PDB file of C-alpha atoms in Angstrom:
ATOM      1  CA  UNK A   1    -220.887 -28.352 -91.419  1.00 44.53           C
ATOM      2  CA  UNK A   2    -217.999 -26.147 -91.148  1.00 44.84           C
ATOM      3  CA  UNK A   3    -214.974 -26.487 -93.042  1.00 47.52           C
ATOM      4  CA  UNK A   4    -211.624 -24.284 -93.086  1.00 50.64           C
ATOM      5  CA  UNK A   5    -208.649 -25.167 -95.538  1.00 50.72           C
TER       6      UNK A   5
ATOM      7  CA  UNK B   1    -207.568 -28.438 -92.588  1.00 48.01           C
ATOM      8  CA  UNK B   2    -210.333 -28.430 -90.236  1.00 51.12           C
ATOM      9  CA  UNK B   3    -213.744 -29.948 -90.313  1.00 56.10           C
ATOM     10  CA  UNK B   4    -216.735 -29.747 -87.905  1.00 56.92           C
ATOM     11  CA  UNK B   5    -219.743 -31.923 -88.859  1.00 56.07           C
TER      12      UNK B   5
ATOM     13  CA  UNK C   1    -217.198 -35.436 -85.930  1.00 56.26           C
ATOM     14  CA  UNK C   2    -214.154 -33.390 -85.678  1.00 57.09           C
ATOM     15  CA  UNK C   3    -210.715 -33.199 -87.507  1.00 52.10           C
ATOM     16  CA  UNK C   4    -207.666 -31.039 -87.465  1.00 51.41           C
ATOM     17  CA  UNK C   5    -204.916 -32.128 -90.043  1.00 50.91           C
TER      18      UNK C   5
ATOM     19  CA  UNK D   1    -203.673 -35.485 -86.926  1.00 52.44           C
ATOM     20  CA  UNK D   2    -206.584 -35.239 -84.732  1.00 52.90           C
ATOM     21  CA  UNK D   3    -210.047 -36.920 -84.748  1.00 57.09           C
ATOM     22  CA  UNK D   4    -212.752 -36.994 -82.070  1.00 57.96           C
ATOM     23  CA  UNK D   5    -215.886 -38.889 -83.363  1.00 55.53           C
TER      24      UNK D   5
ATOM     25  CA  UNK E   1    -213.395 -42.210 -80.323  1.00 56.16           C
ATOM     26  CA  UNK E   2    -210.197 -40.203 -79.841  1.00 57.70           C
ATOM     27  CA  UNK E   3    -207.003 -40.235 -81.937  1.00 57.78           C
ATOM     28  CA  UNK E   4    -203.828 -38.066 -81.772  1.00 57.56           C
ATOM     29  CA  UNK E   5    -201.128 -39.093 -84.426  1.00 56.98           C
TER      30      UNK E   5
ATOM     31  CA  UNK F   1    -199.781 -42.182 -81.409  1.00 56.06           C
ATOM     32  CA  UNK F   2    -202.607 -42.341 -79.077  1.00 56.92           C
ATOM     33  CA  UNK F   3    -206.307 -43.755 -79.337  1.00 61.28           C
ATOM     34  CA  UNK F   4    -208.983 -43.956 -76.667  1.00 61.25           C
ATOM     35  CA  UNK F   5    -211.855 -45.929 -77.647  1.00 61.25           C
TER      36      UNK F   5
ATOM     37  CA  UNK G   1    -207.456 -37.984 -70.160  1.00 62.10           C
ATOM     38  CA  UNK G   2    -210.120 -38.211 -67.875  1.00 64.62           C
ATOM     39  CA  UNK G   3    -213.586 -39.886 -68.177  1.00 64.34           C
ATOM     40  CA  UNK G   4    -216.629 -39.990 -65.889  1.00 65.30           C
ATOM     41  CA  UNK G   5    -219.555 -41.963 -66.742  1.00 66.55           C
TER      42      UNK G   5
ATOM     43  CA  UNK H   1    -220.830 -38.611 -69.417  1.00 63.60           C
ATOM     44  CA  UNK H   2    -217.542 -36.223 -69.214  1.00 62.33           C
ATOM     45  CA  UNK H   3    -214.375 -36.252 -71.032  1.00 60.85           C
ATOM     46  CA  UNK H   4    -211.473 -34.069 -70.524  1.00 57.49           C
ATOM     47  CA  UNK H   5    -208.415 -34.833 -73.062  1.00 59.48           C
TER      48      UNK H   5
ATOM     49  CA  UNK I   1    -211.373 -31.234 -75.871  1.00 58.50           C
ATOM     50  CA  UNK I   2    -214.103 -31.163 -73.306  1.00 54.42           C
ATOM     51  CA  UNK I   3    -217.444 -32.719 -73.675  1.00 57.00           C
ATOM     52  CA  UNK I   4    -220.375 -32.972 -71.394  1.00 56.64           C
ATOM     53  CA  UNK I   5    -223.559 -35.105 -72.256  1.00 57.32           C
TER      54      UNK I   5
ATOM     55  CA  UNK J   1    -224.499 -31.555 -75.016  1.00 58.54           C
ATOM     56  CA  UNK J   2    -221.575 -29.060 -74.853  1.00 58.04           C
ATOM     57  CA  UNK J   3    -218.387 -29.710 -76.405  1.00 55.60           C
ATOM     58  CA  UNK J   4    -215.192 -27.104 -76.191  1.00 53.80           C
ATOM     59  CA  UNK J   5    -212.432 -27.893 -78.789  1.00 53.65           C
TER      60      UNK J   5
ATOM     61  CA  UNK K   1    -215.163 -24.229 -81.535  1.00 55.54           C
ATOM     62  CA  UNK K   2    -218.281 -24.269 -78.928  1.00 54.42           C
ATOM     63  CA  UNK K   3    -221.291 -25.830 -79.106  1.00 51.85           C
ATOM     64  CA  UNK K   4    -224.364 -25.968 -76.842  1.00 50.92           C
ATOM     65  CA  UNK K   5    -227.507 -28.039 -77.955  1.00 50.77           C
TER      66      UNK K   5
ATOM     67  CA  UNK L   1    -228.691 -24.600 -80.641  1.00 53.73           C
ATOM     68  CA  UNK L   2    -225.663 -22.270 -80.579  1.00 54.69           C
ATOM     69  CA  UNK L   3    -222.430 -22.308 -82.152  1.00 54.18           C
ATOM     70  CA  UNK L   4    -219.355 -20.232 -81.899  1.00 53.70           C
ATOM     71  CA  UNK L   5    -216.349 -20.959 -84.223  1.00 48.94           C
TER      72      UNK L   5
END
């Protein structure tokens, strides 16, 4: 899982 | 916002 | 699953 | 908005 | 499934 | 709006 | 859009 | 299976 | 977007 | 399985 | 984003 | 398994 925000 | 899962 | 928003 | 799934 | 909006 | 499914 | 299957 | 979009 | 499977 | 996006 | 699996 | 992001 990867998130950029 | 970017998600990879 | 990939999302860009 | 872009989704690939 | 692919959506662009 | 574009969908491919 | 291009698909080969 | 190959897709380019 | 490019997928090979 | 290979994806470039 | 690049994945090989 | 290899990911570059």
